[PDB]
Design a protein around this ligand. Structure first.
Ligand SMILES: Nc1ncnc2c1ncn2[C@@H]1O[C@H](COP(=O)(O)OP(=O)(O)NP(=O)(O)O)[C@@H](O)[C@H]1O
Ligand SMILES: Nc1ncnc2c1ncn2[C@@H]1O[C@H](COP(=O)(O)OP(=O)(O)NP(=O)(O)O)[C@@H](O)[C@H]1O
Ligand SMILES: [Mn+2]
Ligand SMILES: [Mn+2]
Ligand SMILES: [Mn+2]
Ligand SMILES: [Zn+2]
Lengths: 1009, 285, 312, 173, 173
């Protein structure tokens, strides 16, 4: 039997530090059977993390051998930023049952014949109502406060699946999914409608496939991304219960409990009826047992193929559901316009659409009883497989990555193209067929007349069945466009995204139920085109002064009433829709239009208001060396000093890698156990190399035994040998040991970051396209880029000049109002920013942003400060490009990034410099020539290495183009000798920082012409 | 064969010259010339063909049929063209000079480098096997020059030393032979090492700041300021007009090309740029 | 026996945006291929050798009638042979010096692979020392006005060559190569020019090795597509596949076809060969024989220059 | 420490009198677990001399021979005509990497005398006549793997898979 | 009959006495053709024993050692510790292959014993310290090229070619 993981999950409550050695299972259960432990949850506690093998082999199972009244709280990555859990504790012992009544506030509305709900509905709200008790986020083991309590309570439930797979007789699998070409698929689009919905396509298509998983096995079978703050799992579970059928009062226990934490906005999954942000990673792993759910029980079959194909069929089944739902919708709607077209084509082509425009890989490694056990216990090298099997998985991945199968290579076109067997709508192409202007790699089936009589020209072609539908046609499809089947699907799905619900639920409803629920509710959804975001201030200059500077525009339906219902996923559309101005205009029709332009140019001048700027800003981010950190390497700790390739024979870096883990591992302890390690560590080359160094000093463990003695034997010639072999296999090879706890903690930390940068983006007039665990994509006005980065980088490391939605962004952690949650400061993060004309093809902008940061991360070294001396790092850059004016701003100038608790202002300091400079250039303190005269001082500055000569040269260049004579804005000295070591590439980058400070402002002040 | 004959020719800039390329902001001009792949100026074959097509259609308004045959149609883009230009290769840019105890005192010289000559020899060698194009003195001289690669060479055995474009001091040495004047100007030709030749040539190009002025109060308008490169006068580009076998091609080459001395190339014709003299390499050298 | 194609100027092998491996701030709708598909080489030769008497409603029947089996093509700079290489949307041009131990590299330890192949594509790569990507924007002018026409503004990324490069093909027949020597031919796209020269040379023939270098696209016959791709790690070690067009036939004036192909510069495990020799029913076998004839299914041995057709 | 020794697989019965070892220890590296032959070794620049088997050092980089490494050492009257080295566990290109590394490994190999009198050259040959491996697994690979015919259920699987996974170069001189 | 022999080109000076018969007859295959050195033979699966450095065979083509060939026999007092062999000129693969070979040639490669005490941590070796090439030209190039100071005069690039083109491997020991 499975799904009883509540006791596998709650093998001990978050009251752990409140039952351990004072400061007050003590409570087992009141609404379930007794939790069994012969070796059942024993393994769940011992194999889930290293804390039971890092500190000895029995201390964690005793929870009293090195105790202490004060309980630290350490970061999992850099155990130096501290937190203290103090006295405040889960609500009083005398009322400890009330919270259980608060447990039972919504677990008693639906039948308790099945656990596939009664176990997982609480999963997501477990962490929620608990922080309403404000429990202050205790750690799991107080002798090692590196893993918070809830994280371990989930990590144990993770490998509980493998426990049960050994409880049948033996099985267990690590399956990994990953869609193949994402950055390619996203490239196809024309108005950012297609962009955001192709992102949402990747996301929802991968969300469809693991719904089945969480219904056959329940969550916590998934490792990445953590199903903790999933904006998709939230909506999914929520609508599951809504279809289960309960008064909005009955769900109101969960609705606000979400909206206050997740979905911190107003327009949410109940106003768009869709999650306004795609957050699923295009690749996800799974720890899968050998059981099979087909009814009433869980049977097993010994094969591995029972998943490799049963996941592919589900992935394609989701696409089939979507395409047939679009068939039903376009049928139910031909009487509008532009839907006649979608029906007509889905009938003119059906078989090309029988294969999804994405692909996936799937690898799935095994596990057995052999060498995981002998009879009933764990042997030497038994904690040493999970990360082994994990590496096996990622090795299969990166081996198969050598080949690339683009989706189209699946299509059966040969006959359809050799002869006129391909259907064309519009002009039967003179040359046999055309390529769609969006993919450029497929034959298009809709070919708009370019422009001569666009009104008649297509009414001259029977595509326009009558004089009416031409508006709904000419709206969603620009003249001259050419659409393949796959891109007409996306143009349609951009006409409305609500049909993606068919993909969300993993076939929970029927398809007709979904589409006919959404043909009743009828509401207009809008998506910000590049022309919109390139006019943000242009509306603000017309929002503060509504009609004060609008009198002639009072008739052009821009200064007029927002009419029906229009609502967007764009948060800045939820906070200015009712400002009187309709953000539903098409700015390419009034002033970003050609004929109606010069009029407006003489119009705005008398109201003394600017011409708008034809530039948005495609920001994207990336976490440098994320894979090595999940694998468990130190390239994230030393981004630039060591590369992946310097891990083939890691024995050369035995200076760096052997440091920087000690100071973490040896410090990750506290109290007295720290000394337990603070001596035992170096005694390998420092000592007789074998298990007799610690035997001398082991005694300060046995120096606490007899107060309530429980232990069976004190003859530790093994727990000194085992705590030596542990560190020997990990310093002899200077990697880390990876745990389920490691992974789940990092994925959760990625989800908190997801929330916080989702708030960051729309804090500015941003527009998310894809907020991911370690990545991002957005469009911002060219005025809010730097200040954004400057925080989003900092915020990623965990640092707040502000409360974001309701999350406290402290130093090193992200504390949810009592829950100090660890952030990822040690993880690097690069940025890539493109200042793009609104009339630029998105295909190219996306490609040359992705590749820009794609090779920019892997090409540019800069002079950094490691161990106090000077090294050359390779990642954590912030690249810009106007159109041929590339610029690069580093972001750390230290390695590791923040090795001290107050290093949190080293990060992105350069952009503070650029802000203090740009702020004063335009205030009339410093002339415009500051950026035209550097081409006279640059040579001396880069030829200098006596930093006070350089300081005086900079001071002179600042002073000689000052409008006053009395401004004294100085650059820090440390920004003088750094050098941007780019090598052998036709891209042009200045080889000294201040030139890049100059070029960044060149770009940005140029993004306003 | 389907390229029966080829007529090489030089292109002497009579006025300054601006054949423009994609305006941008990275190279700090606003409007550069057309770089080839090594940064040297070059006239794309499309620009050559289009400009010469327009000139000929204006001049000979009857042979419009023959011109539309050889160079192609525009209302019937069905039948291809019987003739093609190769991208005009920069041959010799004119440079200022200051003599240093040298016999004949010059104030300007022609300057080449060794990539430019490698490309010129590529063209010539490639078209040589047509039985109509011999001019073996030309590629003879080009080859004896290329033999001496790696040294600032002068085709006039008296300079021995110079300062080019008031910035670059080059110490010369003669080709150990007379190698008669390739280009019939009474001016010495200098073939330079590549690294220094690129400097000298980039500094031989004209770069102009231009402005737009309000006619009322004679003050510059906002945003009305840019810059652009011209190729100087006296500059020589090299190209070839490749033709196929037909008899419109023959009548073209027999009377269109006998009378084609001056042509208007590139942009900014109102400013005077773009006049060019085409020298057919079948009589000279 | 071996034909050298020397471009006299940058060339345009229009590829339908098949790739995005470059950052140049261009947005020029038309980019160019590094190595022209064998259809282009075949069409150039057939344009030289065409006689207006074989007129047939099929373009590759007519083409195959003219020329003997052509083999794949690669780079010859200074005698130095350079062969393509792909890593899933990463082109490179490397020598067999770097191919010799390449199969032994393909299965090495994780980090061994990463270091080796990245140094192969990022330092051992001789592309940019050979190829520049020259953006060219053209316009059209209405002779009436002397200003630019409306809607006539095209752009193309030509393939310019820094140092003088040749494209190397091997032809079987010996009599047509007589009328291929010294031919100034109109190689490629936007009316560009190259020179054909033919030379007696030596080359091995169909050695039985383990790994093969896909010197030219391997077409997959649309019946084996599902079967093939669904076990793709069995046939290609490192490379990429894609649904590529075949070109444009001059007589009929339409696009030729669209087939899935194993793009050039791929590494393929010998297995693939038998695969092709299995799913080829006599009729599609006829088709694919003509395809292989014009130059498509060409493989090279990673240890020495030994060409091999898959079928023949 | 630990030791190893080389075995090669031609179509001839010239491996029989090689080693005085069955396993050496209790474990091996070339595992065979219900998916055919794995962990196969291939080494480049060698030619097989099947009649009185010996491994000519040839200078063709795709003159490859397939071998397997198991702890052993032959007959105490060798290592004067054979070669030897202690590879660092990773200079050994092996197909289907499954077995890991223990910081070192000592390996001897049966080396062929140059035969530096005649013009030497080889030709590629692949395994045939299934009977060969049928009696080799009982001539050598049971002498090195006792689990043969006792643990697997498909001996034909390994027949066909060692068939398709081996190929080498016979000197024919 | 015609014969050849492999010469390795190190940076560490070991070529004081490595050949006696250099020229002898008419020709040596490794020549320069107006653009630098041609036909540089690469060999795979080898390593050096740098302390009194001669050749030893490792077991991996991932250590490619690149040298030249010259005719004759050096000092005619070894092959008791050399790899002296013969191949019909087709089984070895040189770069910049110029023309038609004679199709049989000797190879006297300077071999050395493995001495498998500690492992061969092989490491890629580019040729740096320009002065070392400037002295090796007289330590190998000129002393085997009497055509130097006669026909081929460009000593300039013939260094700069093999400032990358002579690449081999080492042991760190
Ligand atoms: N739903 C999504 N929307 C947008 N971008 C996404 C999405 N999911 C993943 N990505 C990003 O897409 C990019 C692709 O990463 P990568 O792992 O290199 O896969 P790829 O680029 O798609 N192809 P491949 O590397 O062969 O797997 C990364 O930035 C991902 O984080
Ligand atoms: N093991 C993993 N599990 C899940 N997602 C991953 C994993 N490794 C990488 N990703 C994500 O998928 C992409 C991996 O490609 P990439 O980001 O280029 O690699 P990386 O491991 O992050 N190293 P780097 O090149 O520095 O970025 C990124 O979008 C990651 O966030
Ligand atoms: Mn991908
Ligand atoms: Mn990453
Ligand atoms: Mn990447
Ligand atoms: Zn399309």
């Amino acid at each position: 039997f499975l799904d009883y993981k509540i006791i596998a999950l709650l093998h001990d409550p978050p009251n752990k530090a409140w039952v351990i050695t004072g400061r007050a299972a003590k409570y087992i259960i009141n609404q379930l059977f007794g939790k069994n432990y012969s070796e059942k949850v024993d393994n769940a506690d011992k194999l889930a993390s290293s804390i039971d093998r890092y500190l000895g082999s029995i201390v964690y199972k005793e929870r009293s051998l090195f105790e202490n009244r004060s309980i630290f709280l350490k970061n999992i990555l850099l155990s130096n930023i501290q937190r203290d859990i103090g006295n405040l504790f889960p609500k009083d012992k005398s009322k400890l049952d009330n919270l259980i009544l608060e447990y039972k506030k919504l677990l008693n509305v639906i039948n308790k014949t099945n656990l596939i709900l009664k176990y997982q509905l609480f999963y997501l709200i477990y962490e929620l109502v608990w922080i309403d008790s404000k429990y202050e986020n205790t750690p799991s083991d107080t002798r090692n406060p590196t893993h918070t309590i809830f994280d371990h309570l989930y990590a144990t439930a993770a490998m509980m699946n493998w426990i049960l797979s050994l409880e049948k007789e033996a099985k267990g699998y690590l399956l990994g999914i990953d869609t193949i070409g994402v950055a390619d698929f996203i490239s196809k689009g024309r108005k950012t409608r297609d962009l955001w919905i192709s992102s949402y396509l990747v996301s929802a298509l991968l969300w469809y496939v693991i719904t089945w998983f969480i219904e056959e096995y329940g969550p916590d079978v998934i490792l990445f991304p953590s199903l903790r703050f999933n904006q998709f799992y939230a909506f999914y579970l929520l609508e599951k219960l809504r279809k289960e059928g309960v008064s909005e009062d009955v769900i109101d226990e969960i609705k606000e409990l979400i909206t206050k934490y997740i979905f911190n906005g107003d327009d949410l999954f109940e106003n768009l009826k869709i999650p306004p942000y795609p957050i699923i990673p295009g690749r996800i792993t799974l720890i899968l047992p050998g059981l099979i759910r087909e009814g009433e029980e869980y049977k097993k079959v010994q094969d591995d193929n029972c998943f490799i194909s049963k996941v592919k069929e589900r992935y394609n089944e989701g696409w089939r559901k979507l395409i047939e739902g679009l068939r039903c919708y376009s049928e139910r709607k031909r009487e509008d316009g532009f839907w006649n077209l979608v029906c007509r084509v889905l009938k003119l082509t059906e078989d090309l659409l029988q294969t999804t425009p994405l692909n996936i890989r799937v690898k799935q490694v095994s596990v057995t009883e052999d060498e995981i056990f002998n009879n009933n216990k764990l042997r030497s090298d038994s904690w040493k497989i999970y990360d082994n099997k994990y590496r096996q998985l990622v090795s299969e991945f990166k081996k198969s990555k050598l080949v690339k199968v683009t989706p189209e290579s699946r299509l059966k076109l040969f006959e359809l193209t050799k002869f006129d067997k391909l259907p064309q709508i519009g002009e039967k192409s003179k040359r046999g067929y055309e390529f769609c202007t969006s993919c450029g790699v497929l034959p298009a089936v809709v070919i708009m007349p370019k422009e001569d009589e666009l009104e008649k020209k297509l009414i001259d072609l029977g595509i326009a069945r009558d004089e009416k539908d031409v508006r709904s046609i000419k709206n969603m499809i620009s003249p001259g466009e050419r659409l393949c089947p796959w891109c007409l699907v996306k143009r349609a799905l951009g006409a409305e995204p609500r049909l993606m619900r068919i993909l969300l639920l993993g076939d929970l409803y029927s398809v007709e139920k979904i589409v006919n629920e959404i043909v009743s509710r009828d509401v207009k959804i809008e998506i910000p085109s590049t022309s919109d975001i390139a006019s943000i201030k242009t509306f603000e200059e017309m929002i503060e002064k509504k009609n004060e500077i609008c009198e002639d525009l009072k008739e052009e339906e821009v200064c007029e009433k927002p009419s029906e219902s229009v609502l967007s996923m764009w948060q800045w559309f939820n906070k200015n829709y009712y400002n009187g101005i309709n953000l539903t205009i098409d700015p390419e029709e009034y002033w970003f239009s050609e004929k109606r332009r010069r009029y407006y140019f003489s119009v705005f001048r008398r109201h003394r208001i600017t011409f708008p700027s034809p530039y948005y800003a495609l920001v994207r981010a990336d976490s440098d060396y994320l894979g090595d950190l999940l694998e468990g390497k130190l390239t994230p700790y030393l981004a630039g000093i060591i590369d992946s390739g310097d891990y083939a024979n890691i024995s050369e870096k035995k200076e760096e890698v052997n440091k920087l883990l000690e100071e973490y591992l040896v410090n990750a302890g506290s109290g007295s156990i720290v000394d337990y390690v603070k001596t035992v560590l170096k005694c390998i080359r420092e000592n007789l190399n074998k298990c007799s160094c610690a035997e001398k000093i082991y005694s300060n463990e046995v120096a606490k035994v007899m107060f309530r003695v429980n232990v069976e034997k004190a003859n530790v010639e093994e727990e000194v040998k085992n705590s030596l072999e542990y560190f020997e296999t990990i310093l002899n090879e200077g990697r880390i040991i990876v745990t389920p706890a490691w992974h789940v903690s990092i994925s959760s930390a990625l989800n908190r970051g997801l929330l916080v940068e989702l708030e960051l983006v729309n804090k500015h007039k941003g527009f998310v396209i894809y907020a991911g665990g370690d990545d991002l994509l957005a469009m911002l006005p060219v005025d809010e880029v730097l200040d954004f980065i400057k925080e989003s980088r900092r915020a990623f490391a965990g640092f707040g000049t502000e409360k974001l939605g309701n999350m406290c962004l402290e130093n090193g952690f992200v504390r949810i109002n009592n829950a100090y949650y660890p952030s990822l400061p040690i993880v690097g993060r690069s940025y890539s920013v493109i200042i793009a004309h609104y009339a630029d093809p998105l295909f190219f902008v996306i490609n040359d942003s992705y590749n820009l940061l794609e090779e920019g991360k892997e090409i540019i070294r800069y002079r950094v400060m490691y161990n106090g001396e000077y090294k050359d790092a390779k990642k954590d850059v912030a690249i810009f490009r106007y159109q041929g004016l590339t610029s690069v701003i580093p972001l750390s100038l230290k390695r590791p990034i923040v090795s001290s608790v107050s290093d949190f202002n080293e990060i992105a300091s350069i952009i503070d410099v650029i802000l203090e400079l740009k702020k004063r250039i335009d205030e009339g303190r410093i002339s415009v020539s500051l950026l035209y005269d550097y081409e006279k001082y640059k040579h001396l500055i880069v030829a200098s290495d006596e930093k006070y000569l350089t300081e005086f040269l900079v001071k002179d260049w600042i002073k000689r183009n000052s409008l006053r004579k009395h401004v004294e804005f100085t650059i820090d000295e440390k920004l003088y000798g750094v050098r941007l070591t780019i090598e052998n590439y036709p891209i042009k980058i200045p080889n000294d920082l201040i030139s890049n400070i100059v070029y960044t402002l060149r770009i940005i002040y140029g993004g306003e012409k | 064969p389907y390229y029966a004959f080829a007529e090489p020719f030089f292109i002497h800039a009579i006025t300054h010259l601006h054949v423009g390329s994609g305006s941008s902001v990275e190279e700090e001009i606003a409007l550069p010339f057309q770089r080839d792949e090594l940064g040297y100026p070059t006239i794309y074959a499309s620009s050559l063909k289009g400009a010469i097509k327009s000139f000929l259609l204006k001049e000979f308004p009857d042979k419009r049929d023959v011109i539309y045959k050889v160079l192609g149609e525009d209302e019937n883009p069905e039948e291809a063209s019987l003739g093609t230009f190769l991208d005009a290769i920069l041959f010799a840019i004119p440079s200022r000079i200051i003599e240093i105890d040298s016999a004949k005192p010059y104030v300007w010289v022609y300057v080449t480098t060794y990539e430019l000559l490698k490309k010129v020899k590529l063209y010539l060698d490639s078209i040589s096997q047509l039985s109509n194009a011999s001019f073996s003195n030309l590629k003879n001289k080009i080859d004896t020059i290329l033999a001496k690669e790696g040294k600032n060479i002068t085709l006039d055995s008296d300079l021995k030393s110079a300062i080019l474009n008031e910035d670059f001091y080059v110490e010369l040495e003669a080709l150990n032979n007379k190698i008669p004047s390739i280009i019939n100007a009474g001016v010495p030709l200098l073939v330079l090492e590549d690294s220094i030749g690129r400097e000298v040539i980039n500094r031989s190009l004209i770069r102009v700041r231009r402005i737009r002025i309000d006619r009322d109060k004679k003050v510059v308008e906002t945003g009305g300021l840019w810059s652009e490169e011209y190729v100087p006068m006296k500059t020589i580009f090299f190209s070839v007009l490749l033709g196929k076998e037909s008899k419109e091609s023959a009548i073209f080459a027999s009377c269109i090309l006998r009378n084609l001395r001056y042509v208007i190339l590139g942009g900014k014709e109102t400013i005077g740029k773009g006049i060019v003299e085409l020298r057919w390499v079948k009589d000279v050298i | 026996k071996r034909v050298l194609i020397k471009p006299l100027e940058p060339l345009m092998f229009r590829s339908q945006g098949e790739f995005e491996p470059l950052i140049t701030g261009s947005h020029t709708a038309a980019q160019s291929l590094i190595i022209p598909r064998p259809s282009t080489i075949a069409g150039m030769l057939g344009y030289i050798l065409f006689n207006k008497s074989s007129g047939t409603g099929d373009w590759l029947s007519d083409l195959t009638n003219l020329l003997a089996t052509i083999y794949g093509t690669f780079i010859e700079t200074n005698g130095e042979y350079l062969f393509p290489l792909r890593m899933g949307n990463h082109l490179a041009l490397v020598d067999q010096q770097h191919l010799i131990n390449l199969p032994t590299l393909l299965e090495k330890e994780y980090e061994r692979r990463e270091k080796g192949i990245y140094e192969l594509f990022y330092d051992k790569n001789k592309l940019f020392q050979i190829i520049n990507h020259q953006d060219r924007i053209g316009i059209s002018i209405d002779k009436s006005t002397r200003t630019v026409k409306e809607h006539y503004l095209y752009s193309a990324r030509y393939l310019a060559f820094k140092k003088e490069v040749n494209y190397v093909i091997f032809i079987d027949n010996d009599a047509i190569s007589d009328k291929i020597n010294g031919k100034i031919v109109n190689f490629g796209g936007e009316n560009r020019i190259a020179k054909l020269e033919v030379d007696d040379y030596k080359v091995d023939t169909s050695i039985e090795e383990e790994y093969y270098l896909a010197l030219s696209p391997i077409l997959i016959p649309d019946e084996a597509l599902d079967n093939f791709l669904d076990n793709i790690s069995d046939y290609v070690a490192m490379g990429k596949v894609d649904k590529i067009s075949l070109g444009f036939d001059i007589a009929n004036t339409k696009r030729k076809e669209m087939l899935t192909a194993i793009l050039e510069g791929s590494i393929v495990k010998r297995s693939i060969i038998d695969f092709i020799k299995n799913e080829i029913k006599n009729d599609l076998r006829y088709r694919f024989s003509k395809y292989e004839k014009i130059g498509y299914n060409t493989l090279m041995s990673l240890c020495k220059l030994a060409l091999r057709k898959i079928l023949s | 420490s630990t030791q190893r020794e080389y075995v090669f697989i031609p179509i001839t019965n010239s491996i029989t009198i090689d080693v005085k070892i069955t396993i050496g220890g209790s474990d091996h590296i070339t595992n065979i677990d219900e998916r055919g032959i794995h962990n196969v070794l291939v080494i480049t620049g060698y030619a097989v001399d099947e009649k009185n088997g010996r491994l000519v050092p040839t200078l063709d980089p795709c003159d490859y021979v397939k071998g397997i490494l198991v702890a052993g050492t032959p007959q105490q009257a060798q290592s004067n005509d054979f070669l030897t080295l202690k590879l660092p566990a990773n200079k050994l290109y092996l197909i289907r990497k499954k077995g890991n590394i223990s910081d070192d490994l000592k390996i001897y190999i049966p080396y062929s005398s140059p035969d530096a009198r005649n013009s030497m050259k080889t030709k590629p040959v692949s395994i045939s006549d299934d009977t060969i491996v049928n009696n080799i697994i009982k001539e050598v690979f049971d002498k090195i793997y006792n689990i043969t015919q006792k643990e697997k259920v498909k001996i034909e699987k390994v027949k066909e898979d060692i068939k398709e996974l081996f190929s080498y170069y016979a000197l024919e001189q």
